[PDB]
Symmetry: D2
């Protein structure tokens, strides 16, 4: 893969406008609602039997903040996402056994959340740059499986 100058500017600029205290909870909660099977990894977070219980769960909100903060840090290292996520790859693959397909699923739900918050600013080109980011993150986090 390869980010263009335009890709980097679009990723960096849009991300600077995200609130990583609500976006993270919103993204992980939406993943858990829309694709229910993912709840299996988070049986320690409490009751996730309904949308309201998930979107209102403080451990979901707290953990989504970690997720997006680590992604925000990675956006400082676009040309080296493999190395930047090496340690989290080890955690997610070797220790938690998260299905590699889930990384792209979460990335697509972040794209949905960006489209909700930014609307018409999320043009096809802007979405293309973010789809490249989703793919790249998923590859970096599944590296230990490959």
């Amino acid at each position: 893969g390869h980010f263009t100058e335009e890709d980097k500017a679009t990723i960096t600029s849009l991300w600077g406008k995200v609130n990583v205290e609500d976006a993270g909870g919103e993204t992980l909660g939406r993943l858990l609602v829309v694709y229910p099977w993912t709840q299996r990894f988070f049986d320690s977070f409490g009751n996730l039997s309904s949308a309201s219980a998930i979107m209102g769960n403080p451990k979901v909100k707290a953990h989504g903040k970690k997720v997006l903060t680590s992604l925000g840090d990675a956006i400082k290292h676009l040309d080296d996402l493999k190395g930047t996520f090496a340690q989290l790859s080890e955690l997610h693959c070797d220790k938690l056994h998260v299905d590699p397909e889930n990384f792209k699923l979460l990335g697509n739900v972040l794209v949905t959340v960006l489209a909700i918050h930014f609307g018409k600013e999320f043009t096809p080109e802007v979405q293309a740059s973010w789809q490249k980011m989703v793919t790249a993150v998923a590859s970096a986090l599944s590296s230990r499986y490959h």
Copy 2:
């Protein structure tokens, strides 16, 4: 599959607020820009060499409207989508050789467009209902392949 009565209500209600004349071209054009390989099915549609050419292309806008008007008719048959799409399955599978993976891709681009147009109104539960609709439509259209 199975649509709950709440899935049907969501699907029909949100669709009634969709302007097909705008959403059609916006959905097909977004698919062509974001996932460029799909342009190979539309060589006769003329200039697709840049995002601005795709989003300005009269044939892309006219075709997207056909697509979304076909999906509007399908929403009147939610609990018989395979029978509803039998003719278009034959067209897309036996005659055009569309990759079944692309039906899922276009339905995901429509989810993105709905998120852009409705923002917050596109809640996690509303997205779940539409995610089941995209899957159901993909399955119905690739039925000739199965």
Copy 3:
């Protein structure tokens, strides 16, 4: 979907030459080794820390037999697989939260086992018929999710 009379004949004839007592453990064990993340669904099955432990594990062999005996019964109902697998869909979706992508994965590991056991006899046309069967079984088992 749709099974041709030649798909049914292929499926039933090749299956009649399959030894389930061997193929069962061989298929589940291959899935656990090749796609290690799926081991997380089988923590109670004991030692799955190495390929030799998985392929020697008595619980994996006993479970694989259940799996393949379930698929043998399904082959007697090829043109009603969704109804046939309704109970196991509820089990795998509502109770175990299996990722629908893993049903496709296991059916692909079975294709590999059939290729190993039958060699040349597993022609391109015979594989096509079995590829439709894996897809049909995945769709039927993930039906609760749709």
Copy 4:
């Protein structure tokens, strides 16, 4: 990703036993039969309306030889598949617009062909190493899309 010493030895040793004058035609032909949509890229090869016509087509056999010869060369460069396939990535993505999902589809059909020819020698571990190879090749060839 990362090949282990064991991965490299397994890939290199099994590949040294493949016949790249028949395996290539067998792999591309099987892809065209099993997953019909792929035939769309090869409308220049002649009649592909049936298994017999595909498996007997001299242009299929001739082109599959190219495919596997380029893969054989890549197996000399396991630690640098991105650079080794850079030029073919440009051809397949920028010029032919091949769907990225097809690269993994072809890789899985090569795995089926290896299982047919090598049988019990294709153990779960041996298949794991080859699945890692399939993923890595698909990533290298789709790089221009990412």
